[PDB]
Amino acid sequence: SGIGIGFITDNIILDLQLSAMEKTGNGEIVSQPKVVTSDKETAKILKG
Amino acid sequence: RLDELRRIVSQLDIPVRQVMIEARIVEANVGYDKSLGVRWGGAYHKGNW
Known about the structure:
This is part of a larger assembly, with two copies of chain A.
Chain A: E1 4-8, E2 14-18
Antiparallel strand pairs in A: 1-2
Family (chain B): Belongs to the bacterial secretin family. PilQ subfamily.
Protein name (chain B): Fimbrial assembly protein PilQ
Function (chain B): Essential for the formation of pili. Involved in the biogenesis of type 4 fimbriae probably by serving as a 'porthole' allowing passage of the fimbrae through the outer membrane.
């Protein structure tokens, strides 16, 4: 990815490279489960 | 006692109520994925990203 190359050879061999990586990742997850349950009872929703 | 028990018998000998339960599952999944790899490579002057 990120590279800058400079090369001389005849007078001197000088190779100068700058290697840079910039990475940006944004992840948004919105999951909403709805369960209908009787009063004072256990109920479950499972997805997976 | 016979008659009273008979009346209870008449009430009790009632068909239990069956119900047909139809539950429908609806799943919709929509997926859009785009990826871009951009490459600028030159070996002539050694510039390659």
